[PDB]
């Protein structure tokens, strides 16, 4: 522990820069407003005294066109329908579930789109029935693979007429890989007389259709949902009103939010100005960084709190909601608390059944770089994915061999002797942020691209070296301090 | 079908043990595997058990911090450092459905004094 | 989950009816609805041996004449003719709520 008058600076230099990175970007933006118009069209509304809106993100400006149309009153309606199910029947709320499911789902995709999930489960579960997990993984592969062929993108692009309804379809069958994966895994390892009833084929298709987490939902444990749909008790209406009202209103936040920081700066539209960011200065490039990790951090926030929060007014324990980037600083403490559904499912169908940190080095490098790639190839294989997972995957390995390398005997001895746990704190400070450093070079690539990721590394790194990295490296020093010292109440 | 147990075993309270169960006559890796144990003075009880196609250990809360179950994929070992527990160890195979224990070992007797 | 038998140890004869009574703590229904309790045989100085596996059901080597009856809460088992190879301690087990608890035992003795 530190001392709080050093505590306090360290946090007051954190806030510093980052509102003065903000500053700096929105002046940018102010600045270059007609070109970035002239060039991206840029939406209007009243929402915030008459600033353009810059609309360039597409995952976000597809989400909110879809559920302003379709999305709220499906899930309005599951919600109804769960609770009526609740009330009159608790025992075929699942199978109630189910239907409302298959019928949201072609309601918004069509037959095709209901037709493909089916036939997916059902190929899935068919050789499931074999009882191999190779089989069941080179089965869930082909599938995947099938989504990224071009003969079948044309076909589908051919079956649909309005080519958002095959990015909602590419999504969904995208997500349902993973439940249908899970299901076939837990499946195959069965080995417990009471579990044997647990995988027939209607709960097969009860987790399938599970309309709260069928577009984009995060990824649930099929225990934790057979769990919780054969309780039988109920949960007090009366406290689910307050649940939701409570939602309702901690979502309509962070959704103003990120329409505030849309409309403030330019970020994705400045992102795809190459040419604009070899010009912008440092400042604004930092805060251009930081923006974008905070737009996504609330984005995600946003589209994952609707289905957490209609699973928690289903009664059941949907996975944790991201923690606040600005606190990570760390590759490990990063991927262990952003995506903790994606990472529970990664953990327990590709880590430990490749063999992780129990069988050497070698063996965790192994084990890393095949959860790795196939988060890759899950996100969809482009070029700048798999430098992404390169990345990441580097600093995971070199962050596990730090921590393993520091935590021997001798050398942990020789610390506790030669320096104090103040300096000790200090120097993993200093580590923490030369590893901040990379983690968000490596997301800018995810977010960017590989030709922002090369605009940053030359820019920071490589033409301004002397002093700017250093600027970066104290910045990021401070903030890790503040980041470390919040790190002992959860971790 | 035959599961087939170590041996006897006269050991002094502080040293550490290890017993084996050797399973013939089905695809090991199919079922799971229990440990009872049967104290003198005492009736069966349930130790826990350890899932023989991922290797993942389950123990009662009881015998907790001490046992270790592994396997050697078609024997499967317990693992213990000792107190004044003599009881008789038993091994058994659970099925997959409708009914846990259809086979049993022979029998493994722990003395410590 | 405790689960208490009676009685302790009782004499017969062969050739007599025999009834083992099996009281849980709790309901032994599991959230599959349906109940996992089954009995077991234990000669003397060997292992254990399955008779019934869910209330009323048989193992497949059983003879004909170990019915097992039984309640939610409250089982039965039932040896209609003594044949002088059912000597032994039955217990009843429980398989529904981790973790899983054998009864105290029942021996049978000959008068």
């Known amino acids: 522990m530190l001392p709080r008058w050093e505590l306090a600076l360290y946090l007051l230099a954190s806030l510093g820069f980052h509102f003065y990175s903000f500053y700096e970007v929105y002046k940018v933006s102010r600045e270059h407003e007609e070109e970035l118009d002239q060039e991206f069209e840029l939406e209007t509304d009243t929402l915030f005294g008459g600033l353009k809106k810059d609309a360039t993100d597409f995952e976000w400006s597809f989400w909110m066109e879809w559920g302003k149309q379709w999305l709220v009153w499906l899930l309005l309606g599951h919600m109804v329908v769960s609770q009526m199910a609740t009330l009159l029947a608790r025992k075929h709320r699942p199978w109630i579930l189910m239907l409302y499911g298959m019928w949201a789902c072609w309601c918004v995709l069509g037959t095709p789109g209901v037709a493909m999930v089916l036939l997916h489960t059902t190929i899935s579960f068919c050789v499931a029935q074999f009882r191999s997990q190779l089989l069941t993984w080179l089965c869930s592969l082909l599938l995947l693979s099938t989504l990224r062929l071009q003969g079948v993108e044309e076909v589908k692009r051919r079956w649909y007429k309005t080519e958002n309804e095959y990015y909602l379809l590419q999504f969904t069958l995208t997500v349902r890989c993973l439940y249908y994966t899970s299901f076939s895994l837990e499946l195959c390892w069965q080995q417990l007389p009471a579990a044997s009833t647990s995988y027939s084929f209607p709960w097969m298709l009860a987790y399938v259709f599970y309309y709260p987490v069928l577009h984009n939902g995060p990824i649930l444990s099929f225990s934790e949902f057979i769990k919780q749909m054969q309780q039988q008790e109920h949960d007090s209406l009366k406290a689910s009103l307050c649940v939701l009202a409570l939602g309702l209103g901690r979502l309509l936040c962070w959704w103003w939010l990120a329409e505030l920081m849309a409309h403030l700066m330019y970020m994705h539209a400045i992102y795809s100005s190459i040419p604009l960011l070899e010009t912008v200065s440092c400042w604004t490039l930092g805060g251009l960084a930081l923006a974008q990790v905070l737009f996504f951090y609330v984005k995600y926030l946003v589209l994952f709190g609707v289905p957490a929060l209609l699973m928690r007014l289903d009664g059941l324990t949907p996975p944790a909601l991201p923690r606040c980037v600005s606190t990570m600083f760390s590759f490990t403490g990063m991927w262990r608390y952003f995506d903790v559904g994606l990472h529970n499912f990664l953990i327990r169908y590709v880590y430990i059944p490749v063999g992780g940190s129990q069988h050497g080095l070698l063996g965790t490098l192994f084990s890393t770089a095949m959860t790795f790639a196939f988060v890759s190839y899950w996100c969809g294989g482009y070029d700048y994915l798999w430098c992404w997972a390169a990345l990441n995957w580097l600093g995971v390995t070199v962050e596990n061999g730090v921590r393993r390398l520091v935590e021997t005997p001798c050398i942990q001895d020789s610390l506790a002797r030669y320096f104090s746990p103040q300096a000790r704190r200090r120097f993993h400070a200093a580590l923490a942020s030369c590893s901040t450093s990379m983690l968000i070079l490596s997301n800018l690539v995810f977010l960017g691209g590989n030709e922002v990721g090369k605009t940053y590394w030359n820019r920071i790194f490589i033409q301004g070296w002397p002093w700017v990295t250093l600027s970066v490296l104290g910045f990021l020093y401070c903030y890790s301090h503040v980041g470390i010292a919040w790190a002992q109440t959860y971790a | 079908i035959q599961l087939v147990q170590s041996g006897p075993e006269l050991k002094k309270p502080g040293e550490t043990v290890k017993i084996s169960c050797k399973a013939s006559?089905?695809?090991?890796?199919?079922?799971?595997m229990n440990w009872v144990r049967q104290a003198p003075g005492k009736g069966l009880k349930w130790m826990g058990w350890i899932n023989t196609y991922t290797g993942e250990p389950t123990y009662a809360d009881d015998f907790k911090g001490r046992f270790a179950f592994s396997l050697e994929t078609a024997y499967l070992q317990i693992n213990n450092l000792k107190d004044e527990d003599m009881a008789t160890y038993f091994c058994?195979?659970?099925?997959?459905?409708?009914?846990?224990?259809?086979?049993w070992g022979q029998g493994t007797t722990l003395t410590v004094s | 989950v405790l689960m208490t038998q009676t009685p302790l140890s009782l004499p017969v004869s062969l050739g007599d009816q025999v009834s083992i009574s099996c009281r849980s703590s709790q309901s032994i229904v599991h959230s599959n609805g349906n109940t996992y309790l089954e009995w077991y045989l234990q000669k003397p100085g060997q292992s254990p041996k399955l008779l019934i596996y869910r209330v009323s059901n048989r193992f497949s080597g059983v003879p004909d004449r170990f019915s097992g009856s039984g309640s939610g809460t409250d089982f039965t088992l039932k040896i209609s003719r003594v044949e002088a190879e059912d000597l032994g301690v039955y217990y009843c087990?429980?398989?529904?709520?981790?973790?899983?608890?054998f009864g105290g035992g029942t021996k049978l003795e000959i008068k």
């Open positions: 058994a195979r659970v099925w997959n459905y409708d009914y846990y224990f259809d086979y």
């Open positions: 006559g089905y695809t090991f890796t199919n079922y799971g």
């Open positions: 087990f429980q398989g529904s709520h981790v973790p899983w608890t």
